[PDB]
Write a protein that binds this DNA or RNA. Structure first.
Lengths: 134, 116, 77, 149
RNA sequence: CGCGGGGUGGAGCAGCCUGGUAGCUCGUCGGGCUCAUAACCCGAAGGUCGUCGGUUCAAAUCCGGCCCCCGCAACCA
RNA sequence: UUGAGCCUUGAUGUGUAGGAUAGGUGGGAGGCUUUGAAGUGUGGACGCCAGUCUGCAUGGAGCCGACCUUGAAAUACCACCCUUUAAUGUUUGAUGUUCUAACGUUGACCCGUAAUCCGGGUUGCGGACAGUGUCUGGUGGGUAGUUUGACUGGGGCGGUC
RNA sequence: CCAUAGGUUAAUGAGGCGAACCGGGGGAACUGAAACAUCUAAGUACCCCGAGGAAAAGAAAUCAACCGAGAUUCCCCCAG
């Protein structure tokens, strides 16, 4: 299934390791090995009960750095997806952007939300692998 | 699957039924079909035509094993016995040899007296 | 007697409290079973009646160290 | 436990490791046969300092001692005569004791505990293969024949 | 009182779990059937999934309840 | 050998519209190729037998995103995962076989010793069973401690409280 | 084989008795609850083992309370 360029992407990010904060965005632009301007895919795991109606979360967040305000709606699988920025941004900028939307989840976390809420944090370049965050 | 090449067809053609069982050369069964399994209940069960479809439904259901050629060892009197080997040969199997293994005793036990 | 040679676990008495709390005098017996211990100094076997927890004291301490205590107390080993 | 080994052992040790084995395996097999010693620092320094270079290699010399036993029997074909009946059929099926008794006068002074005969305890009469397991590494085979005395 | 489930032509069981497309056997009729009665065989008539909402392109299904039918472990006010 | 949890890698999933054996969501429109290409020879894996996938290689260096009919977009690139499952690593459990050192031995023989007790020693047979302890379900009148109402034209029965 | 088990001799000490008290090991039921199973009676009766003139306990991994007290035992309060 794998080809040349993807093998290079795989040898930069090991899917068998959970990383810390400052390691994330540094290796983010190292994932995009294409010439055109790409974006970042934010996949955040929920601890909600997607099979139960009272916990299907949806909302928006006013981002001070843009990709403005981006909208997002969850799935019945339990993970919500949305983009938050692009590849060629500065390291400092997206640090506050990731901090921006997940604390917004602090706001939209249901009262019937059984279990630990924030499960797994992992952002990835549209042409890169998933960079996990604690 | 295991893909076997040669096998042997056991045809138990008795007075009421004609249960056909295709096994391998070692005796291990692969697939089987009966006259009473393909519908045909009652008087039509003890019929050579029912033995025909018994052979057809046993012709398949052994496709996953892919038997090229096989032998035939018929047993019992039965109304089929010779009409069932026809449908098994015309099905697409190579018949090498046909044998008869009807179990006749040498006055072993006292058969029933029934049927008045 | 049902007493462990090493430790000295003698049977104790207690109740057999039921669901309705009916107190019936029962008795707790140590886990005693004779075992043959290979002493390295004498290079032979010495049979002792020990409890299961008594065996663990033997393998954590020295088998000869245990026998030294029995020698100091008179229990014929 | 945490036992420190002396010999190699048939499956886990490499002559001087600290493998955590089952309590019974050490207390009933390893320790009484001198294959290993319990892991208590005093014994550990007795091993890693003293025996690490002394007793470790002299354990190798007895391995060469029965390497001597490999071919003490340049003959490797001893014949015993015991009473038998018609067409083979030994009356007194000789055991492991008697087979060792034959070689003590015609070769190795091997004892009972080393001879390993797979094909029964020798009831029949004819060509036989007797395997002497003098060590856990070397195997010595001896072809013997029994006579119908 | 909690942990699990099952609810389907008149009726016993399927399929659901892994979403879109409901099958099966008796009970009734047209006969065929034979100088006939009996047996047998073929064809046809009958539930839109217990019900109310959420989600989805789509709900019998996934999930929230109710009505319950139960399998129980319990059961020291 | 065989279940299960988990990790990684690689598969996996045809109402019907229809070039698509597409599950949801989804970011951006180039990946891709000569760290040896489209097409094809052939077997295997899968098979609602519709149409995928794929080791080596003659060949020889291309293949296609939006575009369009769809409720949806193209495993060209990618992330978190659902159902079905494949190898490995790893973790324990449940079975079958073999073995010997624990343990059993109310087998033989020798000794303590003129002793059918017992202990010890070679050896034979079983063998991680058996049996014993702690915990636990069941059974249990074998045994134990007890209850088994009052009124009542005497008590019982009936009736009542 | 060595060696232990065993055998023999000598030295030293022990055994039994005694009214209660004392420590430990085992341990009832009648009775009360107006019945009775938890509970009570009671760790009492009784049995057993051991020592002394007393015996047991005993110099804090104890309390207290953010101030302090200082091994154990017994008597009086605390307090029915």
């Amino acid at each position: 299934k794998l080809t040349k360029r993807m093998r290079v992407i795989r040898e930069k990010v090991d899917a068998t390791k959970q990383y810390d904060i400052n390691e994330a965005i540094a290796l983010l632009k190292e994932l995009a090995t294409a010439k055109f301007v790409e974006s970042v895919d934010v996949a955040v795991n929920l601890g909600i009960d997607a099979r139960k109606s009272d916990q299907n979360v949806r909302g928006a967040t006013v981002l001070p750095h843009g990709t403005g305000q981006v909208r997002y709606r969850n799935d019945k699988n339990g993970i919500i997806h949305t983009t938050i920025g692009k590849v060629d941004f500065d390291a400092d900028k997206l640090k506050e952007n990731l901090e921006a939307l997940l604390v917004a989840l602090k706001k939209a976390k249901p009262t019937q939300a059984k279990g630990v809420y924030i499960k797994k944090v992992s952002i990835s370049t549209t042409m890169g692998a998933g960079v996990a965050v604690d | 699957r295991k893909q076997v090449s040669d096998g042997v067809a056991h045809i138990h053609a008795s007075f009421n039924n004609t249960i056909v069982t295709i096994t391998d050369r070692q005796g291990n069964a692969l697939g089987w079909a009966t006259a009473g399994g393909s519908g045909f209940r009652g008087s039509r069960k003890s019929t050579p035509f029912a033995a025909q479809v018994a052979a057809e439904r046993c012709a398949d259901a052994v496709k996953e094993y892919g038997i090229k050629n096989l032998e035939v060892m018929v047993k019992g009197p039965g109304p089929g016995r010779e009409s069932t080997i026809r449908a098994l040969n015309a099905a697409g199997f190579r018949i090498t040899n046909i044998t008869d293994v009807t179990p006749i005793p040498h006055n072993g036990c006292r058969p029933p007296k029934k049927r008045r | 007697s049902r007493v462990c040679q090493v430790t000295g676990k003698r049977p104790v008495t207690g109740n057999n409290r039921s669901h309705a709390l009916n107190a019936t005098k029962r008795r707790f017996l140590p886990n005693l079973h004779s075992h043959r211990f290979w002493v390295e100094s004498e290079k032979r076997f010495v049979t002792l009646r020990v409890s299961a927890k008594g065996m663990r004291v033997i393998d954590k301490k020295g088998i000869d160290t245990v026998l030294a205590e029995l020698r100091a107390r008179g229990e014929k080993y | 436990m945490q036992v420190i080994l002396l010999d190699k052992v048939a499956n886990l040790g490499s002559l001087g490791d600290q493998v955590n084995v089952k309590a019974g395996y050490a207390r009933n097999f390893l320790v009484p046969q001198g294959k290993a010693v319990p892991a208590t620092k005093k014994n550990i320094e007795f091993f890693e300092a003293r025996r690490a270079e002394l007793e470790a290699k002299l354990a190798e010399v007895l391995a060469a001692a029965n390497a001597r036993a490999e071919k003490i029997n340049a003959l490797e074909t001893v014949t015993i005569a015991s009473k038998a009946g018609d067409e083979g059929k030994l009356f007194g099926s000789i055991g492991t004791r008697d087979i060792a008794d034959a070689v003590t006068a015609a070769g190795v002074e091997v004892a009972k505990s080393e001879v390993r005969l797979p094909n029964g305890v020798l009831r029949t009469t004819g060509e036989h293969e007797v395997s002497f397991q003098v060590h856990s590494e070397v195997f010595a085979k001896v072809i013997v024949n029994v006579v119908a005395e």
